Amino acid sequence: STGSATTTPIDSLDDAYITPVQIGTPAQTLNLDFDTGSSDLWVFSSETTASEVDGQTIYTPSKSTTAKLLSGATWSISYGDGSSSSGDVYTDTVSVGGLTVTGQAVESAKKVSSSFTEDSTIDGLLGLAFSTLNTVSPTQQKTFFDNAKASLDSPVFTADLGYHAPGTYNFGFIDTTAYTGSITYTAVSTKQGFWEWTSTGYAVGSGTFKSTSIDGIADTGTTLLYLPATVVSAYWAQVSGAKSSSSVGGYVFPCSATLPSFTFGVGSARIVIPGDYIDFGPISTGSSSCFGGIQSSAGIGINIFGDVALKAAFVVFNGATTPTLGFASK
Ligand SMILES: Cc1cc(C)c(/C=N/NC(=O)[C@@H](N)Cc2c[nH]c3ccccc23)c(C)c1
């Protein structure tokens, strides 16, 4: 089997991408944020604290003839940004782009943090990291991909995120028309439950490439590119007037700037992020200070190749017995 679904930016800055997912019978379509940095499929629901719902579409398990309470199961997730959500668990039929999993754990939110409440366009998250991170207790549950994997034509999914445009998540096949040149594959460590890999270095604009190992995670659920402070300082030093602002919470730059590109290494290959991808616009409405799309990972504890990096590539998440990651230009 295979599945193919379009993923759409939630706003004009590509702050996140949402993908329609069918849950239950008859189908209830919710727009979920596919998150390769976590392993829970959780949704706004008829159980979510009313004051914490602000415009989201909700899953109502009582209206689904295939929903079953997973008795005694609860879940609770704390994301590294400080966001959180928790609740109880149903199993139900879940389909993405024509690919159907029966008996998928659907984690129904009773509580969500304010960040989720404020994101009216995000109806929940669909985790695509390794199932070892799933938070369901006392019986850990499998991700949608892990449940689908044996049935898929090939045990893979791909992320093809657009810059200021829709893109595609495919399951079970590699669309050879979706990228240019060849796909370069690189090793993955699953020791922390993430799609963790090591970039071979970086360049800023037309500058020379610096060969240096940068360990980090491929995370479709994170907006920006978070890298070591040394690398990030080298990037912003090429933008007149750029500075790190503790009051704003990262690097800002004059909105009048033309940003340089940023290149990252994948083995001997190179992925170029155009300068425009690194512009996140005014820090507040009408400001001439703009927020940067490359930020320091210092204090996060891990480097994060978020959407700013991933949207510059066609990315293969290879879930074979020994997982690997592939990157191609597009
Ligand atoms: C200090 C710091 C700052 C950020 C932005 C992150 C990213 N975290 N990103 C994630 O955890 C995502 N994989 C999922 C996620 C967290 N909060 C969200 C809000 C909306 C949509 C997705 C997420 C971290 C780990 C630490």
Swiss-Prot record:
Peptidase A1 domain segment(s): 17-328
Coiled coil: none
Enzyme class: hydrolase
The keyword Signal appears for this protein: yes
Bridged cysteine pairs (disulfide): 255-290
Active site location: 35, 199
Alphabetical UniProt keywords: Aspartyl protease, Disulfide bond, Hydrolase, Protease, Signal, Zymogen
EC number: 3.4.23.22
The reaction(s) this protein catalyses: Hydrolysis of proteins with specificity similar to that of pepsin A, prefers hydrophobic residues at P1 and P1', but does not cleave 14-Ala-|-Leu-15 in the B chain of insulin or Z-Glu-Tyr. Clots milk
Record GO biological process: proteolysis
Keyword Secreted (UniProt): no
Transmembrane segments: none
GO molecular function, one term: aspartic-type endopeptidase activity
Annotated family: Belongs to the peptidase A1 family.
Protein's recorded name: Endothiapepsin
Source species of the chain: Cryphonectria parasitica (Chestnut blight fungus)
Recorded name of the encoding gene: EAPA
